[PDB]
Design a protein around this ligand. Structure first.
Ligand SMILES: CC(C)C[C@H](N)C(=O)NS(=O)(=O)OC[C@H]1O[C@@H](n2ccc(N)nc2=O)[C@H](O)[C@@H]1O
Ligand SMILES: [Mg+2]
Ligand SMILES: [Zn+2]
Length: 820
C-alpha cells in the first residue's frame, strides 16, 4: 500500500478486477432475487455532461447497494440514438448521421467505463440499429391491423424556406426559427396511436404507483384530463339561422363540466372554425380577420393558458334550454376546434377564465352559486367563486338550495326530459401523432399501393432498413428524394408501389427499451418470454423531470399494449421513480461592440489577458456557454472524486451547484480515508474485526461501536428508504471523526478499529467503489461483494443500566427520587 492516494493508479485496476469477475454481467438467475435499476439512457450527442454523471452515479449507488445486499442486479445502459441532433451535425460537418452517431457512442462509452459504473455492457442496445427498431416496426404493423395505429390527415407547420415541417416550439410569430420565413399550415396524412382508447386505463392505474412522487402522478392525471360533464344544446334563435346547414341551423351544442351553473350562463363562445363563426363572418370583415389570425396561430399546449384570451361578438343568438334567456355567440381564440363540440358556455361568476373574459368586454356576470356567508363582488374574482364541494345554488329557480351533485343530476334530468342534453365523459388527451418528416429515425413499415392502399410490410420482410449512407442537406428529408429507397413492389399484389418516407417519433424507441434490455439479442420477438417473466418490471427508474409527462405516459402506454399482445405480464413499467435535480454553474461574459454579451465558458477563465465579468448561476447549457466538462474533472481528480462531489454536494432532488472548493473538499476526504487505513496498517497490520459479546469493552470502545452500528443503520436507511445520499456520507464522516478521537491502540482497540474500517469502506463502496475496493483488499482477504453489506449489531446499541434505571413524590432522573 503506497502512502499517497493516487486515483489514476487504482481506478483502472478495480475496473479490471470487477470486469474479470463479471460482477455486473447478469443472467436470469432463478436462485437470486432480481433487482432492475435503470437510468434514462442518453442521446449520444458527443460528450457526457455533468448532469449525465449525476444521473448515472445515482443509479450506480442504488445498484451497488442492492448488489452488496445479495440481489441479482441488472443495471443496463444504451443509446437513444435517433433524432434531430445527428441530422444537424450532418448539415454542419457534412458527415453521415450514422457515422456521427456511432463515433459519439464509442466515445461516451469509454467515458462511462472510466467512471466505474456497475453496468451490464453485454445488454447494450443502440436504437439506430435494425436489430433494435425492427421490433417497433413489427409492433407498428400489428397495431395497424387492429386499428390502434391509424392514418388520417393532420395539420403541420410547413417552412417554405428550410423546406421541412416545424413543431410549434420552432415557430416565432408565424415564422420559422432558423429561416425566418412565414410558416404555412398544411394538411398531410399522418399516423396516430389511438392512445385515447387507453385513457381510462392510463388514468386509473396511476393509483397503483405508491412509490412515485405525487407531482409526477398529478401531472399525468392533468394531462389525460378526464372530466365528467354535460352535453347541453342551445337552440339557435329564429333570427340567427342565416347561412347555417344541418344541425348547426337547429342548435349550438356545448360541453360543460359545471351544468349546476347553467342558470348562470351569460354568453357562449365558439371556435374560429365553428359553422356559426363561418356563417357570421360571411358579411363581416372584422370577424373574417379574427378567424384568420386564430387559424394562423401556433399556440403550443404548454403555452395555451399563457395566451391572452380574445373574442368578437358574432351578432348571432342561442336560447338557454333551462331559463329561455337569449345568449349572444362570440368567437373566441381559446375555444379549440376538435376538443369536443368546439364550443363552450361561459359563466363569468364561477369560472376564472370567464371572469377575466367578461371583465375585459363588460359582459354580464350572474351569480348562481353561494358558499357560506361569503361576499360576492362582481368586480373582484374570489377563489370561492369556483368551489364545487362547499356550494349551494341561488338565483336558479327550481334548483335553488341544491349542492353540486344533486343539481347536476336535476339539470341532467331536465335536459333529458326536453331532449336538450345528456351526461358525457371527456378527455383532454389527444391521440399520439408519430409521423415525422425527418430522415434520422425509424422508417414506418407501410407501403402505398394504388390498388391495395396503405399496406403494412410483412414480418418476414422486417426491418425496413434505414439506409445509413445519407447526408442530409437542407431541402427536405432525403428519403422523399431517394427512389432507391421508396420505389418497391406491393407486398399484397406485387405491383408498383411506394414506401412511406416519413419516420417515427423518436419517443417510440424510448417507450420500450427497458423491455429490450431483458433480452437484447432475442431475434424472434420484442423480448423473450423467459426474460420478461424473470425481470418483471423496472424496480427503480432515475431520470429528469422533463420526461415526467410525455415519455412516462408513452412508456406506460407501450407496456399495456405489449401486455395486451401477450409479450409481458406487468401492467406498469416502473415501480419506483427518482427525479434527480439539475446542475447549475456561474456564467461569465464580456460586452461586445454591438451592445451585447459574449458568454465565456468557465474552463477558459482564470479566477481569484484582461478578465471577463462574473454573472448569474443557471443550469449548465450551451445557452450561456457555462457547461463544465466532466472529463476534465475526471482527468484532474479521478472518477471517485467526481462521484463523491455529486452525491455529497446536495440531495438528489435538489439542484447541485458546481463548486471548485466542493470538489477539492471531496478529494481531501478521499485522501483522509486513504491515510486513515494506511496509518492503521502501518502501526501493526490487519487483525480479525471485533465481533460478538462486547461486555468488558471499555466505555470508549463501546461508544465507538455504538456510533459504528448507528452509522450502519443510518446509511442503510438512507440508501434504501430515503434515497438521500449526502446525509449518508456525512454520517460516515461522523463515524471517522469519532474513531479519530478514540484511542484504539490496545488489543481490543485494534479489533474495534478493524471493525470500524471494514464497515466504513463497505458503506462508502456504492459512492466511491474504486478506493473502497482497494482499501478493503488491504484490510481483509475475502471478496468485498461476498462479505456483503454491513449488518447492524443490535447489542452495540444496548446502553448500560444504572431501584435501577436504564438509560431510556419528587423525582430527579439520575441522582435521587424523593418519595414525598
Ligand atoms: C428515456 C429517454 C426519453 C431519455 C432521453 N434520451 C434523454 O433525456 N437523454 S439525455 O441524454 O438528454 O439525458 C439522459 C438523462 O440524463 C439527464 N441529464 C442529461 C443531461 C444533463 N445536462 N443533465 C441531466 O440531468 C436527463 O435528465 C436524463 O435523466
Ligand atoms: Mg402496490
Ligand atoms: Zn398492391
Amino acid at each position: 500500500m503506497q502512502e499517497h492516494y493516487q486515483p489514476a493508479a487504482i481506478e483502472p485496476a478495480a475496473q479490471k478486477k470487477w470486469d474479470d469477475a463479471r460482477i455486473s454481467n447478469v443472467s436470469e438467475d432463478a436462485s437470486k432475487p432480481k433487482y432492475y435499476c435503470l437510468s434514462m439512457f442518453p442521446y449520444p450527442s458527443g460528450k457526457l455532461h455533468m448532469g449525465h454523471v449525476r444521473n448515472y452515479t445515482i443509479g450506480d449507488v442504488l445498484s451497488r447497494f442492492k448488489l452488496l445486499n445479495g440481489f441479482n442486479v441488472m443495471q443496463p445502459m444504451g443509446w437513444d440514438a435517433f433524432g434531430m441532433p445527428a441530422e444537424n451535425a450532418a448539415m454542419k460537418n457534412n458527415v453521415a448521421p450514422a457515422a456521427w452517431t456511432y463515433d459519439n457512442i464509442e466515445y461516451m462509452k469509454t467515458q462511462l467505463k472510466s467512471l466505474g459504473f456497475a453496468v451490464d455492457w453485454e445488454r447494450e442496445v443502440a436504437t439506430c440499429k435494425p436489430e433494435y427498431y425492427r421490433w417497433e416496426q413489427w409492433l407498428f404493423t400489428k397495431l395497424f391491423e387492429k386499428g390502434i395505429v391509424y392514418r388520417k390527415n393532420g395539420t403541420v407547420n410547413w417552412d417554405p424556406v428550410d423546406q421541412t415541417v416545424l413543431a410549434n416550439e420552432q415557430v416565432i410569430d408565424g415564422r420559422g426559427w432558423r429561416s425566418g420565413a412565414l410558416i404555412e399550415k398544411r394538411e398531410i396524412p399522418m399516423y396516430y396511436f389511438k392512445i385515447t382508447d387507453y385513457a381510462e386505463e392510463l388514468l386509473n392505474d396511476l393509483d397503483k404507483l405508491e412509490h412515485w412522487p405525487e407531482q409526477v402522478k398529478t401531472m399525468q392525471r392533468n394531462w389525460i384530463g378526464k372530466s365528467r360533464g354535460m352535453t347541453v344544446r342551445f337552440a339557435v334563435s329564429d333570427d340567427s339561422k342565416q347561412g347555417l346547414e344541418g344541425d348547426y341551423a337547429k342548435f349550438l351544442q356545448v360541453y360543460t363540466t359545471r351544468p349546476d351553473t347553467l342558470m348562470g350562463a351569460t354568453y357562449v363562445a365558439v371556435a374560429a372554425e365553428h359553422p356559426l363563426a363561418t356563417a357570421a363572418a360571411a358579411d363581416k370583415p372584422e370577424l373574417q380577420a379574427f378567424i384568420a389570425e386564430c387559424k394562423a396561430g401556433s399556440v403550443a399546449e404548454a403555452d395555451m393558458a399563457t395566451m391572452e384570451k380574445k373574442g368578437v361578438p358574432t351578432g348571432r343568438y342561442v336560447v338557454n334550454p333551462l331559463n329561455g334567456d337569449k345568449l349572444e355567440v362570440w368567437i373566441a381564440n381559446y375555444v379549440l376546434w376538435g376538443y369536443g363540440d368546439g364550443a363552450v358556455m361561459a359563466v363569468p361568476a364561477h369560472d376564472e377564465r370567464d371572469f377575466e373574459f367578461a371583465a375585459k368586454y363588460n359582459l354580464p356576470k350572474k351569480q348562481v352559486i353561494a358558499v357560506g356567508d361569503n361576499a360576492f363582488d362582481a368586480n373582484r374574482w374570489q377563489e370561492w367563486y369556483g368551489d364545487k364541494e362547499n356550494g349551494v345554488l341561488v338565483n336558479s329557480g327550481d334548483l335553488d338550495g341544491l349542492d353540486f351533485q344533486t343539481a347536476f343530476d336535476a339539470v341532467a334530468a331536465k335536459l333529458q326530459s326536453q331532449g336538450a342534453g345528456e351526461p358525457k365523459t371527456q378527455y383532454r388527451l389527444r391521440d399520439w401523432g408519430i409521423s415525422r418528416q425527418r430522415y434520422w429515425g425509424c422508417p414506418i413499415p407501410i407501403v402505398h399501393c394504388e390498388k391495395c392502399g396503405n399496406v403494412p410490410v410483412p414480418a418476414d420482410q422486417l426491418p425496413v432498413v434505414l439506409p445509413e449512407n445519407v447526408v442530409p442537406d437542407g431541402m427536405g428529408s432525403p428519403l422523399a428524394k431517394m427512389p432507391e429507397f421508396y420505389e418497391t413492389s406491393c407486398p399484397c399484389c406485387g405491383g408498383a408501389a411506394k414506401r412511406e418516407t416519413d419516420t417515427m417519433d423518436t419517443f417510440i424507441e424510448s417507450s420500450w427499451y427497458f423491455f429490450r434490455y431483458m433480452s437484447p439479442k432475442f431475434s424472434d420477438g420484442m423480448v423473450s418470454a423467459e426474460s420478461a417473466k424473470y425481470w418483471g418490471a423496472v424496480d427503480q427508474y432515475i431520470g429528469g423531470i422533463e420526461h415526467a409527462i410525455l415519455h412516462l405516459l408513452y412508456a406506460r402506454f407501450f407496456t399495456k399494449l405489449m401486455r395486451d399482445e401477450g409479450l409481458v405480464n406487468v401492467d406498469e413499467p416502473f415501480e419506483r421513480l427518482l427525479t434527480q435535480g439539475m446542475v447549475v454553474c456561474e456564467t461569465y461574459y464580456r460586452e461586445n461592440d454591438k451592445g451585447g454579451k459574449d458568454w465565456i465558458n468557465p474552463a477558459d477563465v482564470e479566477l481569484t489577458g484582461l478578465p471577463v465579468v462574473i454573472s448569474g448561476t443557471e443550469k449548465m447549457s450551451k445557452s450561456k456557454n457555462n457547461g463544465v466538462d466532466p472529463q476534465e474533472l475526471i482527468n484532474a481528480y479521478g472518477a471517485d472524486t467526481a462521484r463523491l462531489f455529486m452525491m455529497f454536494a446536495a440531495p438528489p432532488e435538489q439542484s447541485l451547484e458546481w463548486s471548485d472548493s466542493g470538489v477539492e473538499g471531496a478529494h481531501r476526504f478521499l485522501r483522509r480515508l486513504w491515510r486513515t487505513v494506511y496509518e492503521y496498517l502501518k502501526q501493526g497490520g490487519a487483525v480479525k474485526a471485533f465481533a460478538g459479546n462486547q461486555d468488558g469493552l471499555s466505555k470508549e470502545l463501546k461508544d465507538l461501536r455504538h456510533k459504528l452500528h448507528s452509522t450502519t443503520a443510518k446509511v442503510s436507511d438512507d440508501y434504501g428508504r430515503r434515497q438521500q445520499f449526502n446525509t449518508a456520507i456525512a454520517a460516515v464522516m461522523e463515524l471517522l471523526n469519532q474513531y479519530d478521537k478514540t484511542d484504539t491502540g490496545s488489543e481490543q482497540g485494534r479489533a474495534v478499529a478493524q471493525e470500524v474500517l471494514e464497515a466504513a469502506v463497505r458503506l462508502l463502496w456504492p459512492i466511491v467503489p474504486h478506493i473502497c475496493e482497494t482499501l478493503w483488499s488491504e484490510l481483509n482477504g475475502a471478496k468485498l461483494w461476498e462479505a456483503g453489506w454491513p449488518t447492524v449489531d443490535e447489542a452495540a446499541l444496548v446502553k448500560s443500566e444504572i431501584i435501577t434505571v436504564a438509560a431510556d413524590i419528587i423525582v430527579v432522573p439520575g441522582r435521587l427520587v424523593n418519595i414525598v
